[PDB]
Structure 1
Amino acid sequence: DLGTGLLEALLRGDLAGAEALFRRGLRFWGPEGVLEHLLLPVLREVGEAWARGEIGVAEEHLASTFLRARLQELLDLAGFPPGPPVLVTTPPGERHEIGAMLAAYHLRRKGVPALYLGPDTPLPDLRALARRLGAGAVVLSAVLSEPLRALPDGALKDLAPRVFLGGQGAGPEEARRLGAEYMEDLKGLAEALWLP
């Protein structure tokens, strides 16, 4: 409901009003709630508005940068607990960061030390870092399907002892082909990781 107001504030360059509206939502729904009720709907509307030609790239950039900033702040508010890290990123060629940041946030909320790398990490580099840090897991967020299609069979299999793949670009069959565990629900990710 609040999404229209927030987007209108952003598109008129009223940063203070956007942040105030976002804080109101955060106070009302709480951290998880504001992400499902406000952040994600606005992100989606920005996407759709762009594709319809109602807004241009500058406006989309402004809105996306604002939402990233808000999500980064929630990520840091969940804080960084001890223990072997989980590396969170996106496949090579994937620049959509929000899904990855959400996954890191839901993990940290459950006491999992999710290290958000940013998007678009080469698989050998990722595997090397996981090995060196003794990471328990790698979590990948895929918005587009093409970057997954470009990977060879089994490519995600041994990035770390456990590898999870989600996002709208992914499905069970493609996860199976790549050797990743497929997950749709962020709230359950920590439990899936703690389980064998």
Structure 2
Amino acid sequence: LGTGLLEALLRGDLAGAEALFRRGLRFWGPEGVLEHLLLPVLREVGEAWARGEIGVAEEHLASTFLRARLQELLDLAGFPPGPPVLVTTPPGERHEIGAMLAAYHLRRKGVPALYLGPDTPLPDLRALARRLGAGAVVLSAVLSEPLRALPDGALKDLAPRVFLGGQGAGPEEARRLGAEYMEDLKGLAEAL
């Protein structure tokens, strides 16, 4: 399915790509299709670009497509009432699908995760959390560099709980920034 989907995308067959994604969804289930189809295809797109096998426009097409599929699943999940959890990425972080995954996992567990989009200045994020009485903020870091650019303690009081995760993040950097480090998306809902 992963191969088929990427091949369909690279020949501009959006309809066929959508059918293959839906097949993955029916077999693996919602979480499973993300783990077994969406994530491996995105990773492979990145590796192929890095090896010079595809260009940026091919990656863009695939990413935009898979982002739309995840957004579909996100809107089909519950959005419960009550204090929201704000989900975004650090300033300078333009990879948004990890944040979307975090929001999706939370919503699937009945947590009102408000996905903001990526790349939110910290004072503005803090102000929104405060004004909505958000119980937590969740950040996805794909790159390490946006975290490195932040001063010590910069995440510390965005909200009563601040969670940081993603391939760009680690325990030490979380500690330096004053966030709780989370390894697994499934641990997020537990923590809340």
Q: TM-score range by the shorter chain?
A: over 0.9
Q: 3-state SS of the aligned residue for 1:158?
A: coil
User: Residue 186 of structure 2 aligns to a residue in which SS?
Assistant: coil
Deviation per residue, 1:32-59 (Å, 9 max, x gap): 0000000000000111111111111111
In 2, Cα distance between equivalents of 1:24 and 1:51: 29
CA distance in 2, matches of 1:71, 1:60: 16
Q: 1:28, CA displacement in angstroms?
A: 0.5
Equivalences for 1:11-160 in 2 at 5 Å?
Answer: 11-160=10-159
Q: Mean Cα displacement is larger for which, 75-84 or 167-176?
A: 75-84
In 2, the alpha carbon distance for the partners of 1:82 and 1:20 equals: 33
After superposition, the CA RMSD in angstroms is 0.5
Q: Distance in 2 between matches of 1:187 and 1:181?
A: 15
Deviation at 1:187, TM superposition (A): 1.2
Instruction: Please give the secondary structure, in 2, of the residue aligned with 1:139.
Output: strand
Distance 2:37 2:141 in 1: 21
Distance (Å, rounded) in 2 between the aligned partners of 1:62 and 1:151: 31
- Secondary structure of the structure 2 residue equivalent to 1:84: coil
The percent of aligned pairs where both chains have the same amino acid is 100
Task: Give the gaps of 5 or more residues in structure 2.
Answer: none
**Distance in 1, Cα, partners of 2:155 & 2:187:** 21
**Structure 1 residue 190: Cα displacement:** 1.1
**How far 1:79 moved relative to its partner?**
2.6
- After the TM superposition, list the runs of 4 or more consecutive aligned residues in structure 1 that deviate by more than 6 angstroms: none
Aligned length: 191
* Partner Cα distance (2:159, 2:29) in 1: 33
Aligned mates of 1:171, 1:188 — CA distance in 2: 15
1:52 and 1:91 map into 2 onto residues whose CA distance is 27
The aligned residue for residue 163 of structure 2 is 164
User: Secondary structure at 1:115's aligned position in 2?
Assistant: strand
